[PDB]
């Protein structure tokens, strides 16, 4: 007999969310510490996520079967209808927002009626794309740039960023990138000229891509191939979801500088503690980063696992505190439709729950939303020695903000006023030099951000050049490479 039954409504594109949901229920039903005597059962329905009536109808059928909570992984189109249904029926609604086609998330902006109690808990963190991008452009001292966005991006997600750049007097262009890039660029060459083209190439020297990884890879290749960008270009790509395969392919197709900003998950480092959270064992396929499935997981998939883990802990606490309310068969749109009487107490128990999972820590603030998020910032580099590649520049989170900003020279000198002048002798040899030459050196040291040590030349003279091209003094120190740089009045 099962008294623990949960419902799930998935978009048709969310097959991986269903696979992970079922695996998470499997993993918990093998955990003897949580729900010691009770197995979790479930009913899952797939719906067209652009049909809100179908989403309501199928969610209502799950409520007729009898559920303790409803998990959804779906876009904004049907989100408002499910949230309002959950509020009417008192069913705790664990909402995992899916983006369309890997486009950057924007807030749903459903503006759900606030007269009634909110039964929806938003599992994914707030959209912080606008805050993160503003911090990164500010660090790079950008003043003029173009924002390219995909065909599915909701530009209300950058409205605050646009207001802020306008307040600071920046020249910010917007452009939608059509799903077919070649036509957009081919049309551009046919219609434009050399002057206009030089102006467009100048505009493309600094750009932000607010788009899915597949469109960004195509868009970068097409502009590189047509020579609309060059080695001096600097593009920023921002999206919560860009996998390691996508990052490498973006770096590979790009010339110049590329900055990639994506969501990261603060999970344990040690191999043993990777697939465990306390005594809860996670299936290897989701927690081992060498597994092919784990590397190909969507961000929504990680949140779905942690949602099931959170619900089980909540149900466990409700059963271990003698406050259980049995599930009820509910009916929608009937004369005597009535909410679940156990719903208010279940919602409050889930809301103050917290679990360590695949996303890091999943919990809810007072507003019913998960507050926890971390972004990492990757960047390209180049030398002849290293070739092309990418490394981690920094991290961002909404609490501590930006962390991580985005050699000692051997100096030979010769004393000869007033270029080099001894300001402090300690033990009869200089520690502090002052002078015309030295002040230029202290403008160099501070500005390029190098450290130095200064020692005199072996005779405080440039010397005489010895036979066969041999040098001594300060000059010999440069030739024998025994001093990095020479700060003096050297002729």
């Amino acid at each position: 007999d099962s008294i623990i039954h949960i419902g799930a409504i998935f978009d048709e594109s969310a097959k991986k969310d269903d696979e992970v949901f079922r695996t998470a229920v499997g993993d918990l039903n093998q955990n003897e510490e949580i729900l010691q005597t009770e197995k979790i059962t479930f009913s899952v329905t797939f719906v067209d996520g652009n049909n809100p009536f179908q989403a309501v109808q199928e969610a209502c059928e799950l409520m007729n079967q009898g559920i303790l909570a409803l998990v959804s992984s779906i876009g904004c189109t049907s989100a408002g209808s499910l949230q309002s249904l959950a509020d009417a029926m008192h069913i705790p609604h664990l909402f995992i927002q899916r983006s369309t086609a890997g486009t950057p998330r924007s807030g749903c902006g459903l503006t759900r009626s606030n007269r009634n109690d909110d039964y929806t808990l938003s599992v994914r963190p707030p959209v912080y794309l606008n805050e993160v991008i503003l911090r990164v452009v500010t660090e790079y001292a950008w003043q003029k740039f173009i924002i390219f966005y995909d065909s599915e991006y909701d530009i209300r997600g950058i409205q605050e960023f646009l207001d802020k750049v306008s307040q600071q007097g920046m020249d910010v262009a917007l452009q939608k990138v059509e799903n077919n890039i070649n036509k957009m660029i081919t049309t551009l060459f046919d219609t434009m000229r050399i002057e206009e083209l030089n102006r467009y190439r100048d505009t493309l020297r600094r750009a932000i891509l607010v788009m899915n990884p597949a469109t960004a890879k195509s868009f970068i290749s097409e502009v590189v191939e047509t020579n609309l960008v060059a080695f001096d270009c600097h593009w920023i790509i921002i999206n919560e979801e860009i996998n390691d395969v996508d990052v490498q392919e973006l770096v590979r197709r790009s010339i110049g500088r590329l900055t990639i900003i994506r969501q990261t998950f603060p999970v344990p480092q040690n191999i043993s503690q990777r697939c465990f959270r306390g005594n809860h064992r996670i299936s290897s396929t989701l927690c081992d980063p060498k597994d092919p499935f784990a590397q190909n997981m969507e961000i929504s998939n990680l949140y779905i696992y942690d949602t099931v883990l959170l619900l089980a802990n909540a149900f466990h606490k409700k059963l271990q505190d003698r406050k259980w309310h049995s599930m009820a068969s509910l009916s929608c749109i009937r004369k005597n439709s009535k909410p679940w009487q156990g719903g208010r107490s279940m919602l409050e128990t889930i809301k103050k729950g917290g679990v360590n999972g695949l996303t890091g820590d999943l919990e809810f603030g007072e507003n019913g939303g998960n507050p926890n998020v971390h972004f990492e910032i990757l960047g390209t580099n180049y030398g002849e020695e290293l070739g092309r590649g990418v490394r981690k520049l920094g991290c961002w989170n909404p609490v501590t903000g930006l962390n991580g900003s985005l050699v000692v020279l051997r100096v030979v000198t010769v004393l000869e006023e007033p270029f080099v002048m001894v300001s402090e002798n300690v033990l009869g040899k200089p520690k502090k030099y002052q002078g015309f030459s030295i002040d230029v050196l202290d403008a160099l040291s501070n500005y390029l951000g190098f450290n130095y040590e200064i020692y005199v030349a072996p005779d405080h003279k440039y010397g005489s050049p010895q036979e066969d091209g041999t040098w001594n003094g300060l000059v010999g120190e440069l030739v024998f490479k025994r001093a990095d740089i020479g700060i003096s009045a050297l002729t």
Binding site: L409, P418, F436, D439, V440, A443, L448, D484, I485
Partner: protein, 31 residues
């Protein structure tokens, strides 16, 4: 002989002359 800090030094020497930060120094040791 050969240095990757040469480029930024030559740039900074122009930049100090142009800013007039270099001109203050001349007055300093030479009033």
């Amino acid at each position: 002989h050969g240095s990757p800090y040469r480029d930024v030094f030559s740039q900074r020497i122009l930049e100090l002359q142009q800013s007039g930060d270099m001109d203050i120094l001349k007055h300093k040791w030479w009033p």
